[PDB]
Design a protein around this ligand. Sequence first.
Ligand SMILES: [K+]
Ligand SMILES: [K+]
Ligand SMILES: [K+]
Ligand SMILES: [K+]
Ligand SMILES: [K+]
Ligand SMILES: [K+]
Ligand SMILES: [K+]
Ligand SMILES: [K+]
Ligand SMILES: [K+]
Ligand SMILES: [K+]
Ligand SMILES: [Mg+2]
Ligand SMILES: [Mg+2]
Ligand SMILES: [Mg+2]
Ligand SMILES: [Mg+2]
Ligand SMILES: [Mg+2]
Ligand SMILES: [Mg+2]
Ligand SMILES: [Mg+2]
Ligand SMILES: [Mg+2]
Ligand SMILES: [Mg+2]
Ligand SMILES: [Mg+2]
Ligand SMILES: [Mg+2]
Ligand SMILES: [Mg+2]
Ligand SMILES: [Mg+2]
Ligand SMILES: [Mg+2]
Ligand SMILES: [Mg+2]
Ligand SMILES: [Mg+2]
Ligand SMILES: [Mg+2]
Ligand SMILES: [Mg+2]
Ligand SMILES: [Mg+2]
Ligand SMILES: [Mg+2]
Ligand SMILES: [Mg+2]
Ligand SMILES: [Mg+2]
Ligand SMILES: [Mg+2]
Ligand SMILES: [Mg+2]
Ligand SMILES: [Mg+2]
Ligand SMILES: [Mg+2]
Ligand SMILES: [Mg+2]
Ligand SMILES: [Mg+2]
Ligand SMILES: [Mg+2]
Ligand SMILES: [Mg+2]
Ligand SMILES: [Mg+2]
Ligand SMILES: [Mg+2]
Ligand SMILES: [Mg+2]
Ligand SMILES: [Mg+2]
Ligand SMILES: [Mg+2]
Ligand SMILES: [Mg+2]
Ligand SMILES: [Mg+2]
Ligand SMILES: [Mg+2]
Ligand SMILES: [Mg+2]
Ligand SMILES: [Mg+2]
Ligand SMILES: [Mg+2]
Ligand SMILES: [Mg+2]
Ligand SMILES: [Mg+2]
Ligand SMILES: [Mg+2]
Ligand SMILES: [Mg+2]
Ligand SMILES: [Mg+2]
Ligand SMILES: [Mg+2]
Ligand SMILES: [Mg+2]
Ligand SMILES: [Mg+2]
Ligand SMILES: [Mg+2]
Ligand SMILES: [Mg+2]
Ligand SMILES: [Mg+2]
Ligand SMILES: [Mg+2]
Ligand SMILES: [Mg+2]
Ligand SMILES: [Mg+2]
Ligand SMILES: [Mg+2]
Ligand SMILES: [Mg+2]
Ligand SMILES: [Mg+2]
Ligand SMILES: [Mg+2]
Ligand SMILES: [Mg+2]
Ligand SMILES: [Mg+2]
Ligand SMILES: [Mg+2]
Ligand SMILES: [Mg+2]
Ligand SMILES: [Mg+2]
Ligand SMILES: [Mg+2]
Ligand SMILES: [Mg+2]
Ligand SMILES: [Mg+2]
Ligand SMILES: [Mg+2]
Ligand SMILES: [Mg+2]
Ligand SMILES: [Mg+2]
Ligand SMILES: [Mg+2]
Ligand SMILES: [Mg+2]
Ligand SMILES: [Mg+2]
Ligand SMILES: [Mg+2]
Ligand SMILES: [Zn+2]
Lengths: 59, 50, 114
Amino acid sequence: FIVDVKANKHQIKQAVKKLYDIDVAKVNTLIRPDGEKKAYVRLAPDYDALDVANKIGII
Amino acid sequence: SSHKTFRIKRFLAKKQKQNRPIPQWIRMKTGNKIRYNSKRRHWRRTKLGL
Amino acid sequence: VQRLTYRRRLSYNTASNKTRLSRTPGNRIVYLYTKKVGKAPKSACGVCPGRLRGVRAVRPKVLMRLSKTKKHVSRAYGGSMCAKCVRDRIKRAFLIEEQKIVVKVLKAQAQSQK
RNA sequence: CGACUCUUAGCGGUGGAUCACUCGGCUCGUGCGUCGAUGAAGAACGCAGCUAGCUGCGAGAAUUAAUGUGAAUUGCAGGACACAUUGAUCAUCGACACUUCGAACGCACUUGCGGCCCCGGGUUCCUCCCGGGGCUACGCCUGUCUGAGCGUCGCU
RNA sequence: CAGGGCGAAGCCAGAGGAAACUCUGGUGGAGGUCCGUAGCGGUCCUGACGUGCAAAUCGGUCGUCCGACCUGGGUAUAGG
RNA sequence: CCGCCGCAGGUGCAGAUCUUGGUGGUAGUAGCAAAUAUUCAAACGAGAACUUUGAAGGCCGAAGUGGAGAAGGGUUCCAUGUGAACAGCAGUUGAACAUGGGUCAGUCGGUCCUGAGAGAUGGGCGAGCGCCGUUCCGAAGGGACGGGCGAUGGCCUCCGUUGCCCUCGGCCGAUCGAAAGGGAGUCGGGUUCAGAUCCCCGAAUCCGGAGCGGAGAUGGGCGCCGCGAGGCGUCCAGUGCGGUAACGCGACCGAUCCCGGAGAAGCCGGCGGGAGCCCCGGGGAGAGUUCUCUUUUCUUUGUGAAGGGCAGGGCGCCCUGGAAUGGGUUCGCCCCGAGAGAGGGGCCCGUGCCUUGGAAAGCGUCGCGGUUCCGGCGGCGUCCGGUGAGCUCUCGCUGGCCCUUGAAAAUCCGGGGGAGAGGGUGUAAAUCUCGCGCCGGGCCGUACCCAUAUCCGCAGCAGGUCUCCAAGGUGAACAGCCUCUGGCAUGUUGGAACAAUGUAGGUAAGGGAAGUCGGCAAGCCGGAUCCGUAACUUCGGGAUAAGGAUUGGCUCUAAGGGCUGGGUCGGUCGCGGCCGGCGCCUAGCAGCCGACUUAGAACUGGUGCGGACCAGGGGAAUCCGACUGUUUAAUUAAAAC
RNA sequence: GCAUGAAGGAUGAACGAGAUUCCCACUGUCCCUACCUACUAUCCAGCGAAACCACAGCCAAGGGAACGGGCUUGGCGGAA
RNA sequence: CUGGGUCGGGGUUUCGUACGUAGCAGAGCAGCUCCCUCGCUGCGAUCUAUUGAAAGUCAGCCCUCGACACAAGGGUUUGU
Ligand SMILES: [K+]
Ligand SMILES: [K+]
Ligand SMILES: [K+]
Ligand SMILES: [K+]
Ligand SMILES: [K+]
Ligand SMILES: [K+]
Ligand SMILES: [K+]
Ligand SMILES: [K+]
Ligand SMILES: [K+]
Ligand SMILES: [K+]
Ligand SMILES: [Mg+2]
Ligand SMILES: [Mg+2]
Ligand SMILES: [Mg+2]
Ligand SMILES: [Mg+2]
Ligand SMILES: [Mg+2]
Ligand SMILES: [Mg+2]
Ligand SMILES: [Mg+2]
Ligand SMILES: [Mg+2]
Ligand SMILES: [Mg+2]
Ligand SMILES: [Mg+2]
Ligand SMILES: [Mg+2]
Ligand SMILES: [Mg+2]
Ligand SMILES: [Mg+2]
Ligand SMILES: [Mg+2]
Ligand SMILES: [Mg+2]
Ligand SMILES: [Mg+2]
Ligand SMILES: [Mg+2]
Ligand SMILES: [Mg+2]
Ligand SMILES: [Mg+2]
Ligand SMILES: [Mg+2]
Ligand SMILES: [Mg+2]
Ligand SMILES: [Mg+2]
Ligand SMILES: [Mg+2]
Ligand SMILES: [Mg+2]
Ligand SMILES: [Mg+2]
Ligand SMILES: [Mg+2]
Ligand SMILES: [Mg+2]
Ligand SMILES: [Mg+2]
Ligand SMILES: [Mg+2]
Ligand SMILES: [Mg+2]
Ligand SMILES: [Mg+2]
Ligand SMILES: [Mg+2]
Ligand SMILES: [Mg+2]
Ligand SMILES: [Mg+2]
Ligand SMILES: [Mg+2]
Ligand SMILES: [Mg+2]
Ligand SMILES: [Mg+2]
Ligand SMILES: [Mg+2]
Ligand SMILES: [Mg+2]
Ligand SMILES: [Mg+2]
Ligand SMILES: [Mg+2]
Ligand SMILES: [Mg+2]
Ligand SMILES: [Mg+2]
Ligand SMILES: [Mg+2]
Ligand SMILES: [Mg+2]
Ligand SMILES: [Mg+2]
Ligand SMILES: [Mg+2]
Ligand SMILES: [Mg+2]
Ligand SMILES: [Mg+2]
Ligand SMILES: [Mg+2]
Ligand SMILES: [Mg+2]
Ligand SMILES: [Mg+2]
Ligand SMILES: [Mg+2]
Ligand SMILES: [Mg+2]
Ligand SMILES: [Mg+2]
Ligand SMILES: [Mg+2]
Ligand SMILES: [Mg+2]
Ligand SMILES: [Mg+2]
Ligand SMILES: [Mg+2]
Ligand SMILES: [Mg+2]
Ligand SMILES: [Mg+2]
Ligand SMILES: [Mg+2]
Ligand SMILES: [Mg+2]
Ligand SMILES: [Mg+2]
Ligand SMILES: [Mg+2]
Ligand SMILES: [Mg+2]
Ligand SMILES: [Mg+2]
Ligand SMILES: [Mg+2]
Ligand SMILES: [Mg+2]
Ligand SMILES: [Mg+2]
Ligand SMILES: [Mg+2]
Ligand SMILES: [Mg+2]
Ligand SMILES: [Mg+2]
Ligand SMILES: [Mg+2]
Ligand SMILES: [Zn+2]
């Protein structure tokens, strides 16, 4: 995800959790050179990322 | 350097985003005189000075 | 020979940038960054040049996760003062109090005279 | 006989003079003569479907409301309940909104580190953790509370 | 901050001596010590270059190279 | 847009090394010459001296033209596309242009701490912005424990909580100040076009917060019942235990307060221990050579953190005992009646080895599949020794040097003390630095260059710019010279020719400084071994003085070490096992193993031999400054300082 | 003693990229110059500046601001 | 029915005797000896013969067409 630079890992985890009604195991964030914050949100093992990507519309 | 403050990194972010050519459709607009971005910075020619 | 490189951004051979060579299960030699050598306590006597025995020689913060036994000797002043100087202070304390009673009673008796 | 060189004319170049133009200056004059802890001036960063600058704006971000207006905006596109008359657009602007730094205000200036109060969650029933809100600068005035003094006194 | 040279004090053994002490061999490893790298510097060719590689550089040759040594970063001193 | 009558002026250019803009001759000229070097074929393509692939010949040569960083740069990184411009020739290439992508952390840093220093407040000064000052002219504490008082009903069960009071508290100075100082704790394998101790897999750990064990702790006395065992009553204990000791065990109460330790430190020498590297003798697997010969040559031949055991190292630690006929002992020292040696033991480190990790993974090799862009599946292997003044790192020990003595603080720990706290024999209690379990670790940086092309010097500039890793041969040696790993294409062009003059290198008959201001430049010398070394002298030097000889190859000779074995008359089973006048000289000997050096000799070569490389010319004086050190960055290195 | 001389005079061993003189050895320093190598220069393909410039560019004498490319009088003068 | 190119050959000349093979040549050393014996084999710089050998030699040396191809062309101009 691309997230607000203000947000931290706790906020990103909490936002993703009940925006998409899933559980999150880990959040890894970086700030890319264009100033945006990119979050790698690893879901719980029971949740499937491909399934969630379909419901979101990513693919 | 790889070591950088958040303020310097955010400053370098704005300078990269600005260093792009004009959209080609800008030229078609009425009363247009901008034929090319005159504020283009090349990393090796002109330095930011920070 | 396979030459090595640092694994951290500190590129200077400082006191904190100390490394030991190690062979990995992957058939390659790498640096491992060593912890600083610990030092056993010097005796509180302040005279004996040697360091105490029975106490682990680790860095100060490591002592916070060691058990009490690993940090002290089962004796009075154990882990803080050497045994030899504890022996001396035991008899020095005893003998001097003995002299004080000797002087006090001697002074008590030194009243018959002028 | 040619080249080459020079001179003069024609045409072609190179260059940007000249002339014409002018939403820009300069000068004079007139009316008004209003910034800020209710956060200014200035700075930073961000904001457009395509947009980098200029401009405009502040996470409600090339604008919201309202009033006036009355069919556009436009470089392309899209929307007949996003192609609108039940109000497009433009103007006005009194309503709402208004990120960070900045006199700049918890401390420090690293998006570094606190403290107090309230709310929600962690089955919270304590500690603790996370999120949110409010507060926490210096000087000074009046008033209040709490006090200090072998300062001056009264009573016992 | 290669590698070598010289070999201070201390120490050991042997020999000589009445003693004072002396002699010999070894050990030892001192010094703003020597030769000489890296480093630092810049002697001479009055060499190259001299509209240069360079608004001071290059080559050979040089000085020093455990010290009054070389060096990064932090910090202090500000125009009579 | 102009004429005429008037009005007004920033009103007339050839120049001012005039100002700004443009343009020539020079001139297709100077130049595209520092650091050895390119060639063949093919591919793609309109197009090839320059791109790519393969082959060859070369170079850097581990003090790199290699592999990674700091500062600085800031997207230059990576992929694809383009070929206008730019990359001083070209270009299908690029650090160019266009489009898209890329930097993932509790344990790598920042963050925290102080350093030199910076700097608020009180105070003082100052017309004033402000300045001085940093404990000084301050009522500079806002915290905690036990207790007492009152409420709270939250989990009214009874502890948290709240206000007050008492008690104690120097905060002896706010705050800032290090991506090299101090500072807990993450490693192995795999993965991308580009990320990685950060992702994935696996194995750990530190810190912070609040269940189950285990410890505390269940002992003894006296009566009664019972064959006994055991139970019952009742009273008394119990903040663990062991070792002569050094100290040990898994915990093993404790506050204000005090003491200490760690953090916490110079430079240099010598020696030893442990790696990694190199070397060697063998065994494998694959590779190279094979005209000939070489059981040959090359390549390859793992086990992370953390835990447990252990080897090894160290100890001014302890017990015994009591030493001169002094002894022990080092390369050097040094140690001893203030306790040597000798015997027994204790502690610390433990980076090494074995084990859990662990072979499942990695790697080598031979095969077999496929979803052919699979962390594919199999087989076999990943072995046994030696050596060392080797080299690098690390750890110790022990010295030397100083009119030089070589941070602080955060932070953590031990001890002294004993105010307290805990329950009355239990289903024990306070309590617990023992084991396991549960939850959490926010924010920022992280791509790449790091340099004869990503930084500074106007540039892809021969300049400048802080570090880590460091192979084989020769050799004294990170010297020079050659090679391997890794890298590169000769430093912004290529072709042809080989005139003068140059720049760089070299040789020269005979002479030998006659050259010249001057031996400037060049040349001579040069290593090592063995000889031999003067004047003078501050007795240390001078000194490699001067001068002389030798030096290759080959075959020998001699010398310089380590480890093991003491076996004793077996009458003889707990022809192996241990007792039996005992053998008990000279292990002074026998076997085995190993490294590198020195000396001597013979033979031998077209007298060559430090064969390249490396590598002092010397002497006699005079002047000056004692010396070493410093200096005019960019004309002076000196006798100047 | 133009004009030496005492915190400086006088002397020094060792040291010196310090100034000077001589000798040995050594040499292309020179007699006396030659030859060789590399890289240029040279020619070519591509690329391609700058300084400078009144106008220009053959002399002798003359006179002239007393040393002329131009003037005078002679010598002469032939593309690129 | 010739020429001048390449290759080859010869001459010349430079250096100094090639590889391999053989040797009761080789300082010595090691093994195998009884088979003879002082034999035989291995290592070994160097020596001797083959071997004035081998190698180079016009690219600006000399003589050769022995061999092999090549040569009757190509382009641009020039008139009293
Ligand atoms: K409207
Ligand atoms: K860097
Ligand atoms: K730090
Ligand atoms: K030092
Ligand atoms: K292992
Ligand atoms: K001379
Ligand atoms: K000096
Ligand atoms: K000098
Ligand atoms: K022969
Ligand atoms: K011969
Ligand atoms: Mg991060
Ligand atoms: Mg630059
Ligand atoms: Mg790194
Ligand atoms: Mg202990
Ligand atoms: Mg024209
Ligand atoms: Mg034009
Ligand atoms: Mg509106
Ligand atoms: Mg900071
Ligand atoms: Mg070395
Ligand atoms: Mg000696
Ligand atoms: Mg010296
Ligand atoms: Mg020296
Ligand atoms: Mg140098
Ligand atoms: Mg010169
Ligand atoms: Mg020149
Ligand atoms: Mg420095
Ligand atoms: Mg320094
Ligand atoms: Mg001034
Ligand atoms: Mg005017
Ligand atoms: Mg004018
Ligand atoms: Mg003009
Ligand atoms: Mg004029
Ligand atoms: Mg030219
Ligand atoms: Mg040239
Ligand atoms: Mg070289
Ligand atoms: Mg080489
Ligand atoms: Mg070298
Ligand atoms: Mg070009
Ligand atoms: Mg690239
Ligand atoms: Mg670009
Ligand atoms: Mg942090
Ligand atoms: Mg101040
Ligand atoms: Mg700080
Ligand atoms: Mg540090
Ligand atoms: Mg990378
Ligand atoms: Mg030193
Ligand atoms: Mg291991
Ligand atoms: Mg281990
Ligand atoms: Mg396996
Ligand atoms: Mg060592
Ligand atoms: Mg106690
Ligand atoms: Mg990186
Ligand atoms: Mg450069
Ligand atoms: Mg450089
Ligand atoms: Mg600049
Ligand atoms: Mg080396
Ligand atoms: Mg070498
Ligand atoms: Mg070259
Ligand atoms: Mg080239
Ligand atoms: Mg270059
Ligand atoms: Mg010659
Ligand atoms: Mg001569
Ligand atoms: Mg001669
Ligand atoms: Mg002579
Ligand atoms: Mg002369
Ligand atoms: Mg002369
Ligand atoms: Mg000279
Ligand atoms: Mg002399
Ligand atoms: Mg010699
Ligand atoms: Mg003189
Ligand atoms: Mg001097
Ligand atoms: Mg010196
Ligand atoms: Mg100078
Ligand atoms: Mg000098
Ligand atoms: Mg100079
Ligand atoms: Mg002086
Ligand atoms: Mg006088
Ligand atoms: Mg005088
Ligand atoms: Mg004197
Ligand atoms: Mg004339
Ligand atoms: Mg004259
Ligand atoms: Mg003239
Ligand atoms: Mg006239
Ligand atoms: Mg014939
Ligand atoms: Zn003591």
